Structures are given as structure tokens and as C-alpha cells.
Amino acid sequence: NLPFLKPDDIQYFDKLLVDVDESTLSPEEQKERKIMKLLLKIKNGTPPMRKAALRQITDKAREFGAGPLFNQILPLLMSPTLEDQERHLLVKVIDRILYKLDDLVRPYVHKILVVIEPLLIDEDYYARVEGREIISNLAKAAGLATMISTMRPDIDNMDEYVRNTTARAFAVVASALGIPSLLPFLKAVCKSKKSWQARHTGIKIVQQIAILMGCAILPHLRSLVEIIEHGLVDEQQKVRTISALAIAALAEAATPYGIESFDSVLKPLWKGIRQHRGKGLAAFLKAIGYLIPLMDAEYANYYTREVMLILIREFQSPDEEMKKIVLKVVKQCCGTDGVEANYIKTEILPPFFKHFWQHRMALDRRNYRQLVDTTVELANKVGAAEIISRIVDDLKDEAEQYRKMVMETIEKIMGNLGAADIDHKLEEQLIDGILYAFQEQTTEDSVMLNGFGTVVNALGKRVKPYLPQICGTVLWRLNNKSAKVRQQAADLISRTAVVMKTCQEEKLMGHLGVVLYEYLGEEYPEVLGSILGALKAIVNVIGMHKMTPPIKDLLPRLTPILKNRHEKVQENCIDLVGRIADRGAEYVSAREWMRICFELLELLKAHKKAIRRATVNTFGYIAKAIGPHDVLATLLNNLKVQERQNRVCTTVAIAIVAETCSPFTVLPALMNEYRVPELNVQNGVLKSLSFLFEYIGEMGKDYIYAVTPLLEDALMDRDLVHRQTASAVVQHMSLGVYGFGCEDSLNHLLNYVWPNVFETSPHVIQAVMGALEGLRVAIGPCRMLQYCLQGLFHPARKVRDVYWKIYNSIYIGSQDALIAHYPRIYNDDKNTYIRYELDYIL
Amino acid sequence: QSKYIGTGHADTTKWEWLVNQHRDSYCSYMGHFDLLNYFAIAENESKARVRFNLMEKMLQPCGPPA
Amino acid sequence: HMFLYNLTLQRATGISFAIHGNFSGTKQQEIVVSRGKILELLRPDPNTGKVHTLLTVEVFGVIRSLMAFRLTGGTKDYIVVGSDSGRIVILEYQPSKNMFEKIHQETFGKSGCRRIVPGQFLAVDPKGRAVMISAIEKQKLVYILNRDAAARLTISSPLEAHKANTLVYHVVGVDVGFENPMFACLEMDYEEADNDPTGEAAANTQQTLTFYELDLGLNHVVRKYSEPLEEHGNFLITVPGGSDGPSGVLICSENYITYKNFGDQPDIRCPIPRRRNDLDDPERGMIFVCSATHKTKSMFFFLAQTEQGDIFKITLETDEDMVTEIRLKYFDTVPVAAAMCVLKTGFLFVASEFGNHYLYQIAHLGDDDEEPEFSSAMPLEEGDTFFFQPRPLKNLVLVDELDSLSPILFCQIADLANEDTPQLYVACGRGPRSSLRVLRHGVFNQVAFPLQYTPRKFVIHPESNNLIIIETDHNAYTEATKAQRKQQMAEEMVEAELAAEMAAAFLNENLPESIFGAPKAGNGQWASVIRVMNPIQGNTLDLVQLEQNEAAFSVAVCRFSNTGEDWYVLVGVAKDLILNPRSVAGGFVYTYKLVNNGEKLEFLHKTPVEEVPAAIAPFQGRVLIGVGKLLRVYDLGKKKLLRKCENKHIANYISGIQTIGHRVIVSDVQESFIWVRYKRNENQLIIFADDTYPRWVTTASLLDYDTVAGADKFGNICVVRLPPNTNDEVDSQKAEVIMNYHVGETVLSLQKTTLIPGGSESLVYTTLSGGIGILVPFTSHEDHDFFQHVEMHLRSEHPPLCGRDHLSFRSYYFPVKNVIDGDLCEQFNSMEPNKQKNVSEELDRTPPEVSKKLEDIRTRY
Amino acid sequence: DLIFCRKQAGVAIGRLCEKCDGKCVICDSYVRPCTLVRICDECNYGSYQGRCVICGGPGVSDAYYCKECTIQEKDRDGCPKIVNLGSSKTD
Ligand SMILES: CC[C@H](O)[C@@H](C)[C@H]1O[C@@H]1C[C@@](C)(O)/C=C/C=C(\C)[C@H]1OC(=O)C[C@H](O)CC[C@@](C)(O)[C@@H](OC(C)=O)/C=C/[C@@H]1C
Ligand SMILES: [Zn+2]
Ligand SMILES: [Zn+2]
Ligand SMILES: [Zn+2]
């Protein structure tokens, strides 16, 4: 049939709508129509039909020719209405047909490249990788010589954009056919004396080669640098700039190996940073920055000492890009061995914090990020307190961006290195600065919260004297007009609960718990969840006995909050109720727990995973707290009265109760609920048994004999749903008690599971197969092979079918074990079947 | 299914099944060190020699079919 | 209701793989070895010339292929392992912590030593850019290896290189320099051989050498070049390529070594030199058992060992791109090895396939050798080959010897010397390198006494304490037979006149079979000998040589109520036994009187019987003898042994029998145990019990009157027990298996005993790979629950090193039942401290408490 | 109508949305996520990167086989991405 056509498809395959079916009417251009048909089947259509069309177009690729094939493909590729997945389908048909037609594409190479060269600079990353894949397939199809002959004239075009595009195309063909394939061509181009754009694009080719191939250029690194080294001292300025950038990219790709292959370009760069300025100096410094980490400690010391004066001079350049490059180079220098920290804190740090740590940098995003990361990395070598002291007093700056920048820096440094490096003065000014920065903030963003939490947790016990002021401020901010302020306060309490606990300030945290309890009536859901989390933290640090408010008053207040619809409130409230049920269970009555039970069964159906995990945990906690009998009874009655949608909740709860209160408290009542003559309640009991055994796992090792007679009755109950569910039960049974010595009981159950293999209903036969696979796992493949042998060969064809299905299952499952279990098949006149080696006796 | 060698159907001949399990056995001998050691002690041959013999017998372990 | 705890006392000492490299990342060259399911790191000290074991790790799997690789510009060598999981692993040894850090673990198939699931073969591009893991049939997988910004190894997705109905003999990566990586495989298609009922295709199909090329540009793998071979080869060797060598491969075959390379390179073949006046069978071929390469910045050479144990040095003559000839020179003679390693600083490590391993120092590389060197240029016709005479070693000097109990064939624990604590008497070794060793402990100390052939069983004389050992080997000559063969050779070679003096020199030359191998020849020849050995002094008090085709398989010393309290020794012997296909003439039972206080065998008579007597067991003044599938009671007559009672309903073939009271426990070769009752009143043997499972039982031990523990050919241990108060006059009784466990090594001896006096009674087993293990029962269920929790926690938190699942591993052929793996539990002390703290608080105690518990359970024995 | 990809899985980790966050791709079980799901390169390329392996929605966490499948080694059968054979790649 003809697949569907979207509007934009009409212009491309409209000729397929015409009903002139007869091929003799076609003037040998059925090839055109055949390609149109195949491409329409590939682009639009199910996986089977597009697979068939792809195979068809690949098997006939040479019979068609590259000409019409690409003259129909390329228009579709550059269409602005093309979807990304359609583009991928086109790229894959392209590379397959290109593999098929070897040199048939050579004349059209040019015509192809100009259509697909823009893809190499497209914003979409996948478009770029597809363009590179297409160029590489082209270079593998059409010879290297053809690629060179086709892309050579553009290397000295006056426009620079075409030069860049052909340079990256040459990089791609170098990746496709190997660097040594282009080594002589690039060596000749980089020294081309006729044009300077030629050598410019040549060393740009090697730069893009490094950028694209990464560490895979380490074998040819010395050859590439020997090809491009002369361009450093070339009198044209742009070519030496791009040769410096190419050296930078080569060092970046080769990290951390291959410094010895750079022994030539060290002296030219060293001279150039004294003989250059502007963008060329930036390029030279960037190359040296990516080059320094590869050096040995001694030579790193020497070379950094040589370049340090020039770079700290450039520290104060008007061009911000030069500032970014010198920031990266100081980060690269101080991150390596050899340059010791005393040198850094004597020479580099003062001008660094002079010219780089000014408020102007707190506005540009990338400058902000690079400055912060550079300072944090410096702290790893020079010392945490050494850097924190130079910027801590700036925490009290009224420019909010500057103080948030310094706050993030202090946060990351103290999270990396703790606080053992900090003395008393630095500690006090840290506390003062974080207090001011938290009190005077317009927005409620997480930088200040994270900084406060991390600095307090890093100080640890050292924070005892400042806790009264911290808690006064958090109490003052809890009573605020903005919800996102009290939310942040509650989150700070949640994060510093344990460090307050170690400081032994339990009365203050009790007051915090009381004000949170009285704020529990909050309307905004996110901040209510935050204060619930703070309450949970407080109840976790101080015990369930000395908790204020008492648990007796705290839990019934939480009970109605479970009906709130917001997921954050749900998760936090469930977690708090669960901690209470784990520890302070003795303080509330059994009926409050039963009401919470009723409102927890619903939350087992939450779509968010954490909410239902918490629900499971707290339900198990309260089931361990109160008696299993009452909840089990109401759950069994629920099992009877409930429909399928909410029956899964009650079965999961039954399994949870069986796991927390050992199953002999749940299995008797469940199994007796099976004797009622109604069959649907029997099926519900069977499904609950199935999930119970899957859920308890190894716990069910002591209960196979108990549930055995019910399964005997259910497996020949002449109701297909019952047999299917019972087979699922024994499957989960055997998979849960694997390796716990339940071989005899499961072998007994196997005899009742087996006769159901001759069933036709797909669901019940797949359930029986799953039961047999689990029984293979638990009993062993030898016994299942013993059961299969009696029917592997047999006059009846259908019994052969079923027994060969079972054999295939156990053979795929345990192919290597069967070696010891195959029967002794004697020889005959025609063949020899005895495995004589296994009969050897030493 | 069809992708996995050694599986069978209702038309699997005795010869096919037995040559499959014989090849499985020979590969398992190649794999398990102590099994091959037992074989190389029973027959007074080196481990390389018995491995070569097993790979040779892999071709027609039970004989030609009908 | 018995629960056991398993502990290895002496780990396996038999090496299956060995590779050398810079695993420490320094000047030092280490060797990692795969022995069974254990991975070990050893460091040879160049100053003292002695090997030290730095690291030992139980990986709980079956290592099938071991290889080392390095990336460009790197300093340390990684370890890539293929095992019986569906996983390939890459590891790095960290010397800071003395551990194997798992760098990568990639999953591709199901577990086990399967046929089509890769793991058996490993090859790696000589530059480290890719690695191919291959099955024996069909499927192969190539992984691309690279680094990142932080110099951390990264592995890609697998690339498929499958070819249906295709076997694989070997695969190695060809040194193509930095071109597209290529892997050379020895293959053979069986599709045509299967669909042809005559046999034309099977005989006409031939092995092929194929090259899978990895196009990194297009990023796929293509079957590029494939060519048949007129000779079927067994393995491949990569020759250096690119800059410092001519790319290509060496193919070792039967009676030849070939060089081949893709392109217009002519195949350069050369026959393998055969021994001068070899006593082996003239119609028996010759192949190489292992190879080793050593690269200099000036030259490179190869070392290849023959089945005979002769190591030859191989060099290739270079004419720019092409090679001109293959040159070979007889280097030396060491025991047959599974792996050889040529380190720097002039040291050669030889890992024997059986028995002790060695390390030599290279004194001279045999370049200034007066001995003739051979080459492919030398011409000859009629297929006559190059010859050479073996000589005592002088290129190498033995600098270290490592004791290896592999292969343990029999074991008995007893305090023969009055040390008040028992010792382990272990009949192990193989061929002329066989040995009876006495092991003590206070790891074990050992003393070794050499033997002639491979020992099968040995019994202890109660009054004298001496041992009656039987040693038997296949296709070997007896002493008289090798003497007469030497005589016939010397008399035939003088017909062609200095041949008289040459024959005198040949006959007066008796090279030690301990070093130059035993002159072995024939298809059904059997060299067998009985000996009586003192257990304290290595001296043998008497020795009895048997006929040329008589092979001893069972021995027992006992008295008879028929005669007095004088002793007797019975030996069962097969005649004209063929192993494959199996056919035998019959059996004989030799009866010796054993006089002079257990020091002299006095022959009495020699009874023929229908098949091979595989088991002899004393039985209240009579003996119990298993002849094929027949069980018989024999009394000592004055001219023969007269049958008194027979049972003919044993399944296949009796391998062993043990008696408790009047119960007889018969081991079948395939059908597990069979309980037989001897009714003394009526004089009849009645089968009354058997098993519900088949087991290839190798040994067995009686636990009590109802319980029997047995060992499997497939490395399993089981414990079966009869139902309570089973009546022996009612048949059709089945025994239930109360214990199942997989050791990972094939156990050949089980014995219930106490190693330290007064301590715990336990179950000691010995494996075929030289391992000593113990199973101890649990005193209280408190400890049992503790160790079950420890086992499950270590399973979840310290998974096996090569991607295997521990529970699945210990359930290899049967689901594990009532055994705790103490070898896994004791890896608690090698975890990261935070994981130790977590799993300890989960056990509600401190890590030192858990440690102390493990130490006390090990000292308890 | 719906079938598993079953191609050779690679180094891409399968993903799951919020609706299917705790489910097993093979047997739809929520009990004991054991080992990590790997998918083939073709099912992870393009706009399909990070999408749910089961339903195809936006992935929020990683996908796992259940322990029952791990025990039965059903995590060794290939790429478990569910593909619909009656839908083009634009639907
Ligand atoms: C009859 C089986 C069936 O599939 C139902 C569970 C399914 O129809 C529901 C749909 C839904 C939406 O209601 C799912 C609920 C799922 C729940 C409550 C599961 O916890 C989760 O999914 C959350 C986490 O990943 C895992 C939590 C953990 C470790 O506690 C686990 O415990 C064990 C022992 O596995 C508990 C498993 C729970 C059954
Ligand atoms: Zn599952
Ligand atoms: Zn997929
Ligand atoms: Zn989903």
C-alpha cells in the first residue's frame, strides 16, 4: 500500500499519486519512480516496511546509479520541513548506499558536499554528527584523491567562512581515512608560499583534527606539530594566531601525555609572549596554558616562572576575552605539580584578588562561573583559609551579586576542605558575613541557603556560641510575608538539625519544633512541606520522649495532612509519620493508626516513586507497631468488597503485614478466606498469595507446606484463571526460596503444575511456562530435563511441540549444566553417541 | 528460538540433538579446567594435544547423518 | 539437618594462564596467573631470583582467557578477563592497596561455559585500541578502548562479528601498526559437513585463516580476507609489525610451522625438527603446546615448546617488507608448560601444565651456538624432517622452583609418624613427575618422594604403616619394553660402519624421563607398577613391574578369615584397555602374600575375570570386587579367587565400593550411588536403594549408617541420606539429597577426620587443581544465621571479581543446599572500610567483632 | 503489535519516566530492582536519548530489571526497548 503523505511531502513524491500504472509508458525513468517509491516507503512507514525498502534500495544501489539516487535524496535532506528522525533515516540510507557504490559517487562528490557542508556547523549536535558521518562515508567511498581534488580549490578562497567549512571537512576526511593519509598534503599546504590563506586553513585543519579526534591523535602528535610549528613565527599575524590555537587544541586533546613531542614550540611561544600583544598574545597564552600541565615538575616551575610576569601583567587588560584566557591559564598553572603554593600566594594571589575580584565580574555569567571555579581550584593547592580570608569581609557588600558570588565560592571551598584550616578571626567574620548576607537578600535563591548550611556543618561543634543569633534570625524570618523566606528558614533548620544536636541546644530546638507545629496550618504547599521536613529533622535529633509538642499531640495533627494533594507535602508528611511510627509508636492509640492506615492505602497508588516508597515504609512501621490482627481483618474485608482498581492496594498491604509480622500471622486467615464457595474471592486470595510470596522472598521458605494444599486444589480447579494465578504463585514461590532447601515441597508442587502444559489459552500457558522456569531455577535443570525426556520424542506431534518448547526454555536457561544431566544414549550401527570421555576412571 | 543453536522443534532428529549435545560437551570440556585436566591425566597426553583432538572431533562428533 | 561451612586451607597450585607486564606501573615486571577460579599476582625478584606471591583473589568463576594490554603513551598494563559469566572485565592492580580494582565490566550474554556465548577466546590490538572476545562457535564481539580527559580507560558498545556454523580454534590481534585494527582467526565451517550424509564434506572441509578488519572510520567489523590451509593448525602467534617488524602471523600446526601475511606475501612453511632416535610412536605427529615472544628495540625472537618438552627459538629473516625464511634452533628442555613468559633482566618463567613450576635465568640465548640451526631454506623431499638430539640444559639455569600439588589423584589423612597429629599423604603429580607428598601444618609444609608413573590409589598396612601404591599410565612403555625397544632400534639402525659406536653411545644414553619426558607410544599400551613405600623415609621397600598391556586400577590390603592372620594384597588390572572408543579384553586380580612385616610382595595367584576390576574392598574375612557392572564377594582359594556371591543389576560400571556393617555403597560411573544389602544367612546381594539424580561420582565417604557424601566429575560435592529406618528387604527405596555444593574444582578425595587433635571433626577434600578444602558443621543455629547473613551481604556488596553471580556459581549444576561459602565470607577483611562499617552495623556489631568471628571459626577447624 | 528491540545492548543506560519509575521492563514488577538496564545504540540515538524505555515518555530516572529476571538471567536477552511495529518514527 501507499503510506501517508504530509503536506510538505506532496512536492517530493507527487508523481506517485498518478495512476498510470503501466511500466511500458515509463521512458526508462521507472528508476526515478522506483527511487521515489522506495524513499517514500523509507521515510514514512512502519519499521517492517521501511526495513524492507532499505534492503531493497541497498541491494539495487549500483543498478540505479549515484546520479538519480542522490538527485532525489539531496532535495529531501535540505528541506526545512524535515524532522530529525527523518533526517537520521536519510543519513542511514545515504551511508548504506554509499558503502554499496564505491567509486560511482566520485563525479557527484562536489554536488553532494555543497549540499551537506552546512550540517557541520548546524546548531543541532546530532545534525553535526550526521554531517560528519556523511562526509566520512563519502571519503571512504570516493577515494582520498577525489576528496582532495574536490576540496582543494577552496583552501585559498577570499571568504573565511568557506575556508572554515572546508577545513573542518578536511578534518573529517582525515578522521575517516587516517591522519597519515593527509599528512603529506597537510605538510605541503602548511608551507604553501603562494597564498597565506592556504597555510592558515591548513593549520586550522590540524586544529579541527585535534578538536574532533581527541586523544586518538597521540601517535601522530609529533608529526602534526612538526608540520605546523613554522607557522608560529610566520610574518602574517592571523596564521601565527591560528597556529597557536592549533597547538592549544593539540595539547588539550593529548592531555596528559605527549609533552616531549612539544619540545620545539616551547621557545617560540616563550619569545612570542614577549614579542606579541592583542589577540595573538591571547592565542600564545592559551597554547602555553594548555601546554603547561603536561610538563615535568622542574620544567613546569621554570616555564611558569618565565611566563608569570607577562600573564599577571595581562591580568588588567581591557579585552574581557583576554581576561578569560589568562584566568584559564592561571587555573591551569596552579593545578599542576611543580608550581608550589608558596610561590602562588607570594606572586599570583595579590594581583589576582586585586584585578579579578571586582564587582564588574559579578554581572557576566561566564566570567562569574570561571572566576568561581578558578578560585575554588586554587584553594585546593594554596589553602582554604588562605583564600577565604581575602574575600570574607566582602560578604557584607550591598551589591547582592558580588556577595552571592563570594558566598558560592566560600561554600564550595569549605565543602571541599572542611574547616580545620580556619582560625578564630576568620570564623567570626564568616559568621557575621553569612548572617548579613542571609538577612539582607532581595531574592530567596539557594546560594545563601547552601552556603549557610555547608559552613555551619563544616564548623560542627565550633558553632555553639553563634547558635542563639542564628536561631533568632531564623525565628524572625519564619514570621515573614514572603512564603519563599519561611521556606528557606525551614530548609536551613532541616539542614542544620544534626549540628545543632551535637552542640546540645535541645531547649532551643524544642522551641523551633513548637513554632513549626503552630505553623503546620500553612496554606502554601511547598513551604508547608519544608516546615514538615524541618519538624522531621527536629524530631530526629531530639528523642520521641522529650519532643515538644509531644507525639500524643503532634501525630493527630499530621493525620489530616495526608489528604493534601501536593506531592512534596505528601512525601514529607508520610516520612514524618513514619519516623514517629518507627520510634514514638507507644504514644498514640491503635485507632489513630487505623485511620492513618485508611488514608495510606490510597497513597500506595501515587505516581511519584518516592511517595509510594515512603508509604510502604510507614505502613510497615505502623503494622509492626500495632497488632497485625485488626489491620489484617479490615484488609481481608476490603479484599472482599473492593473492585480490581483498589484491590492491588489491599494485596500490597497484606504482603507488607505478612513481611513485618511474620506470614504465619497472615497466611491462616488468608487461606481460610479461600473456603468460601464464591470464586472471585478465591481468585483475590490467590492473587494476594502470589504477590505475598514474590514480596517476602526468602521469608516464604517456612510456608510452602502451609500453602501447598490450597495450591493442590487450585491447580486442578477446572477454572482457567485459578490455574493461571496458582501457577504464578508457585513461580514466585520457587524464585523466592531459591537456594534455601525447599526442593521437596516445590518438586511436589511441580506434579500439580505439570498437567497444565497442555492448555491453549495464551495467558494461562505463559503462566505455566513461567512456573516451570522458576521451578527449574529452584529445583535444578536436571529434574526438568528428567521430566522432558519422557516426551521429547513421541508419536503425538502436539506433545512433541509442548515438550520441545519446555526443553528449549530449560536449554537456553541452563545449557552448560545439562552437560552433566543428558542420559546415556547408546551407539548403533550408523553412529556413535557415547561420550566416552566421561566414562574415564582414574 | 531460531537464533540460538541447540534448540529443537517437533521435527528434530535424534542425530541433530545428539551432535548438538556432543558439541556442547566438547566446548564445556574446553572451558572447565579440571575436567580437561582429568581427561589429560586419563589419556597420557598434553592439554594442548587433547584440546586439538577435541577441536578435531567437533566436526563430525557422532558421524554422518542419514 | 546438617549445615556446612566451606573453607580453603591450601588454594589451588595448578596454573592455567600466565601473563607478564608492568601491572605495578613501575620498572618492576609482574606476572598475573589464573589458577582455576583464583587470580594471583606474583613479583619475581631479579636480585635473589625467587618468585613471591603478592596477591591472591578468589573470583568465583571459571577463567577461560587472560590477556594484558596497554594504551598509547601509558605506563601501566591492564588485565582483561573472559570468564563463564556473560561479561568481559577489565581490571587494574593498585599497589597502594594491593587489590584488583575493577575498571570495567560489560555484559553481553548468559552465564556458563557455553558454546555460542563469548568468553573462551581473547585477542587485543597490539596498540590497545580494541579487544575481541570470542566464543568457540559463531559469535564474536569487538570493544573499542580509549581514554578521556582524566586519562581514565573507557570502553565502547560491542560490535558484532558473527558467522554461523563456524568454529574457532584461536584468535589473535595482528600488529598492523596504527592502521585499522585486525584480528586473525583460525576457523572451520561445518555447514556442508552436516548436510552431507556420505562424509565427503567432512573429510574435504579444511581449516581457514580469516582476518576480521575493524574499520574505525565507518566503525564496524568486516570479514575481509580468508584463505584455506593445507595443514590443520592449533594456534597462532602475532609477529611484530608496523615500524619494528613485518606484520603477519605464525600458524603452528601438526609437524609444521607456517608464516602467512595478507597481500602478496608467499606462505613460508617449515617442518618441526623431530628428536634423534625418538622412542615415541613413529606414526604419532607433533605440535606446539605454548609460545612466548620477547621484543627488543633491535631484534625479536619467539620460543615454542613441543609436546616432548623441547623449547626451540624461532627467528624471521627480513628482506624489507617481505620475510625470506623461518629459522629455528633447539634451545632447551623443560617440563611441558601451559604458559611461558620471557621477562627482562634475563628470566624465563615456566608454568607447567602439571606438577611444580619453575623460573630460570637466561645465561646464553644460543646465538654463539655450535649446534646446528635450521631454516625453511634448507631443501628436502619425501617429507623427511630435520633432526636434533636433546641435551641437558645450559642456556638456562634453575633459579627457583614452586611447589604445585596439582594434580592430586589420591589422599589419605593419618598420623603415621607418631607426631600425635595427623599428616596428609597425597599421591599427585603426573607421569615421571608424579610424587607422593607428605603435608604437615602449624599453609602446609610438604616433602616429596618421586614416583615412576601416575599414581591411582594407595592403601595403608595397619601393622606396618607402609603404603601400597599403584602407578599406571596410558600409552607408555614398561622398563623391559623400553629396554627391548632400545635394543631393536640399535640393531635396526646399524643396517645401512661407525654405526656400532653410535649405537653404543645411544644405548649408554639414558636421559631422565623426569626432565625429557617419558618415551610414550601406542594407542592401548599401559605401563603399570606396584610399589611399597615407607611413609617417613622416601625409600621404596619393594616394587613389582607388570606386563606391557596390564594396567592397575584398584588396590587393597586385608586379611582373610579363610587363612590365618597373615596379610594379603589384591590388585585389579585391566588388559588391553582402549579409552576411545572403549573396548577391553578382560581383567586380572593379582594376589600377593605381603611377607616380612609389610616389606616384600610374595606372589600367589592371578585370577582372570570378565572386565576390569575397578574396586577392591575388604569385607569381614572376604573381599568385595567390582568387575564392570558386576559386584562380587570373593574368598581366597589356594589356586585362584573363587566367587561366593554376585549381583548383576548395577546400572553401568562400578567405580568404588565402601561398606558399613553389612551395607554396601556402590558408586556408578554415571548413576550416582546404589545401596546393596548382603544377607549373610541366605548369601545373596540385594539392591535396595539408589538415587533420583545421576552423578559422575569420583570419590565418596561414609558419614554414618544412613548418610553418604560424594564428589562429582564436574567439581560438585553432595551429601545424600536414606529415609529413617529403611528396611533392606524392601526395594524401590530412594535417597534424598540433603546437601549440594559446587567447589569449582574437581574433587578426587573426601575424608571425614579431625586435623587438629581433640578439635572439631570436619570433612576434608582435595581437588584436581591441587587444592585442599574443608567443610565444617555448625555448632549452633545462632552462628548459622550469622554466617548466612554474612554470605548474603558479601554477595550483594562484594560481588565476584569477574562478573559471575556467586549464588548462581555455587549452584552450577544443582541449586546450592546447606553450605555457606567461607571463602566469600573471609573477603570481608578486604572491603572498603565504609562498606565494612555498613554491613557490620547491619549485623549489629563492629567490624573487629566480625573479623574475630571469622578467625575463630577458622582456628576451630 | 509491540515487541522488544532485542538488538545487542551497549553502554547506554535505559531510562524511565515518572509513571513507570519503579517498574521492570520485562515483567512489569515493582519488587526489588536489581541490575541496571542497558539499551542498544540505535534506541538511544537522536531525540530518543533519555526517553522512557517502556512507554516512551520523558525519562526521569534509570531503568532496572527486577531481581526475579536477574535470577533467571532475563537481563541477558538484549535491548529491552519496546518498539511499536504499527507506528512510523513521526507519529
Ligand atoms: C500487585 C503488583 C503490581 O505490580 C502493583 C504493585 C502495581 O499496580 C500497582 C501500581 C502502583 C503505581 O500502585 C505501584 C505501586 C508500587 C509499589 C507500592 C512498590 O513500591 C515501589 O514501586 C517503590 C520503590 O520502587 C520500591 C520500594 C520497596 C523497596 O519498599 C519495595 O519493596 C520490595 C521488597 O521490593 C516495595 C514495592 C512496592 C510493591
Ligand atoms: Zn522483571
Ligand atoms: Zn534497542
Ligand atoms: Zn514510561
What are the backbone angles phi and psi of residue C673, rounded to the nearest 5°?
A: -95, 155
Q: Radius of gyration of chain A from Cα atoms?
A: 38
How many CB atoms are closer than 10 A to CB C775? 24
CA distance A717 to A725: 11
Give the number of beta-carbon pairs within 8 Å between A and D. 55
Which residues have C-beta within 8 Å of that of residue C410, sequence separation ≥ 6? C426, C427, C428, C455, C456, C457, C458, C748, C749
Q: Of the candidates D53, D21, D55, which has an alpha carbon nearest to the alpha carbon of residue D39? A: D53
Strands C310-319 and C322-333: antiparallel
Spacing, Cα D63 to ligand 3 middle (Å): 14
Cα separation, D51 vs D54, whole angstroms: 9
Q: d(Cα C190, Cα C212) in Å, to the nearest integer?
A: 19
Nearest to C813 by CA among A787, A803, B28: B28
Contacts of B6 in chain A (CB under 8 A): 811, 815
- Determine the 3-state secondary structure of A369 from DSSP: helix
Q: How far is CA C140 from the centre of its chain?
A: 27
Nearest 10 degrees: CA dihedral of C332, C333, C339, C345?
-40
Q: Which residues in chain A have their CB less than 8 angstroms from residue B60's CB? A: none
Contact A408, A369 (CB under 8 A): no
C4-402 classified as CATH 2.130.10.10: yes
C89 Cβ contact list (under 8 Å, min separation 6): C80, C81, C83, C102, C104, C105, C106, C801, C802, C803
> Which chains reach chain D with 3 or more Cβ–Cβ distances below 8 angstroms?
A, C
D29/A694 touch (CB, cutoff 8 Å), yes or no: yes
How are the residues of chain B apportioned to helix, strand and coil, as percentages rounded to the nearest 5? 60, 0, 40
Report the C-alpha gap between A824 and A826 in whole angstroms: 6
Ordered by start, the domain boundaries in chain D are 1-91
Q: Are C821 and C6 in contact (CB under 8 A)?
A: yes
Write down the residue that cell numbers 554581572 correspond to: A363
* Inter-chain residue contact D71 with A777, CB threshold 8 Å: yes
| Other beta carbons less than 10 A from residue A178's beta carbon | 17
- Method of determination is X-ray
Chain A CB contacts of D45 below 8 Å: 88, 126
Q: Residue A186: which residues within 8 A CB-CB, separation 6 or more?
A: A170, A174, A202, A205, A206, A224, A227
- By CB neighbour count within 10 A (0-12 exposed, 13-18 middle, 19+ buried), where does A158 fall? exposed
Rounded Cα gap, residues C270 and C255, in angstroms: 9
CB–CB contact C158 D75 (8 Å): no
Using the mean position of ligand 2's atoms as its centre, give its distance from the Cα of residue D34 in Å: 9
Closest by CA position to C71, among listed C181, C171, C147, C179: C147
| Nearest CA, atom 6, ligand 1 | D30
Residue pointed to by grid coordinates 604445585: C404
User: In this complex, is the C-beta atom of A840 within 8 Å of any C-beta atom belonging to chain C?
Assistant: yes
Distance from CA of A726 to the nearest CA of D (A): 17
Rg of chain C's alpha carbons, rounded to an integer? Answer: 29
Atom of ligand 1 nearest to the CA of A659: 34
Cα gap C233→C255, rounded to integer Å: 9
Mark yes or no for CB contact A738/C807 under 8 Å.
yes
Q: In B, which residues are within 8 Å of C115 by CB distance?
A: 5-6, 23-24, 27
A266 within a domain of the structure (yes/no) = yes
Pick out the residues of the known binding site of D for Zn(2+). Answer: 5, 17, 20, 24, 27, 40, 43, 52, 55, 66, 69, 79
Our count of domains for chain A comes to 1
Type of residue at A431? I
Residues of C in contact with B50 (CB under 8 A): none
Contacts of D38 (CB under 8 A, 6+ apart): C107, D9, D10, D11, D12, D13, D14, D79
Question: CB of A613 closer than 6 A to ligand 1?
Answer: yes
Q: Resolution in angstroms for this experimental structure? A: 3.0
- The H or E element that residue A380 is part of is helix A365-382
The residue ranges of DSSP E strands in C36-178, in sequence order, are: 38-45, 50-58, 65-69, 78-82, 87-94, 99-107, 121-124, 130-134, 140-146, 154-155, 159-160, 166-174
Torsion of CA A664, A666, A667, A672, to 10 degrees: 130
Strand (E) or helix (H) holding A427 = helix A424-439
Burial class of C725 by CB neighbour count within 10 A (0 to 12, 13 to 18, 19+): exposed
Query: Sign of the CA dihedral C485, C491, C497, C503?
Result: positive
CB pairs under 8 A between A and B: 61
Do the chains contact at D90 and A83, CB–CB below 8 Å?
A: yes
Interface of C with D (CB under 8 A): 86, 106-111, 141, 155-158, 160, 805, 808
Annotated binding-site positions of D:
5, 17, 20, 24, 27, 40, 43, 52, 55, 66, 69, 79
How close C305 gets to chain B, by Cα (Å)? 11
Q: How far is B21 from chain C (nearest CA, A)?
A: 10
Q: Which atom of ligand 1 is nearest to the CA of A610?
A: 23
Q: Is D1 on the interface with A (CB under 8 A)?
A: no
CB A242 within 8 A of CB A167: no
In CATH terms, C408-777 corresponds, of 1.10.510.10, 3.30.200.20, 1.10.3720.10, 2.130.10.10, to 2.130.10.10
Distances (CA, A) of A47 to A1, A52, C298, D2, D86: 15, 9, 58, 12, 8
Name A665's bridge partners: none
Secondary structure class of B44 (helix, strand, coil): coil
* Ligand 1 atom at minimum distance from D22 CA: 25
Beta carbon of D22 within 6 Å of any ligand 1 atom: yes
**Backbone torsions φ then ψ of A123, nearest 5 degrees:** -65, -35
Cα–ligand 4 centroid distance for D12 (angstroms): 17
Domain limits for position A157: 1-823
Q: Does D2 contact chain A (CB < 8 Å)?
A: no
**Would you call A745 an interface residue with chain C, using a CB distance cutoff of 8 Å?**
no
Q: Quick check: helix, strand or coil at residue C695?
A: strand
Please give, rounded to a whole number of angstroms, the shortest distance from the CA of B58 to a CA of chain C.
8
Say how many residues make up chain A: 842
SS3 call for C344: coil
C272 CB-near residues (< 8 Å, 6+ apart): C255, C256, C257, C286, C288, C306, C312, C328, C385
**Residue A630, CB-side half-sphere exposure with 13 Å CA sphere:** 14
CA of D59 to the centre of ligand 4 (A): 7
Q: Is the peptide bond before A256 cis (omega within 30 degrees of 0)?
A: yes
A chain contacts of residue B42, beta-carbon cutoff 8 Å = 837, 840-842
Q: Which chain C residues are within 8 Å of B35, Cβ to Cβ?
A: 713-715, 746
Closest listed residue to residue C786, CA positions, set C835, C753, C822, C758: C822
Residue of D nearest to C107 (CA): D76
Question: CB pairs below 8 Å between B and C: how many?
Answer: 125
Strand ordering across the sheet containing C733-742? C654-660, C663-668, C673-679, C684-691, C733-742, C716-721, C707-712, C697-702
Q: How far is CA C4 from the centre of its chain?
A: 27
Task: Tell whether C288 lies on the interface with B, counting CB pairs under 8 A.
Answer: yes
Q: Are B28 and A816 a contacting pair at CB < 8 A?
A: yes
**Protein residue with its CA nearest to atom 28 in ligand 1:** A613
CB-ligand 1 contact for A647 (6 Å cutoff):
no
Task: Tell me the β-bridge partners of C45.
Answer: C50
List the grid coordinates of B4. 540460538
> What CA dihedral angle connects A562, A564, A565 and A570, to 10 degrees?
-40
Facing C736 at nearest CB: one of A214, A744, A780: A744
**Ligand 1 nearest atom to the CA of residue D28, by list position:** 4
> Relative to the CA of A615, which ligand 1 atom is closest?
18
* Cα C796 to ligand 1 centre (Å): 21
Partner residue opposite A739 with nearest CB, options C218, C614, C807: C807
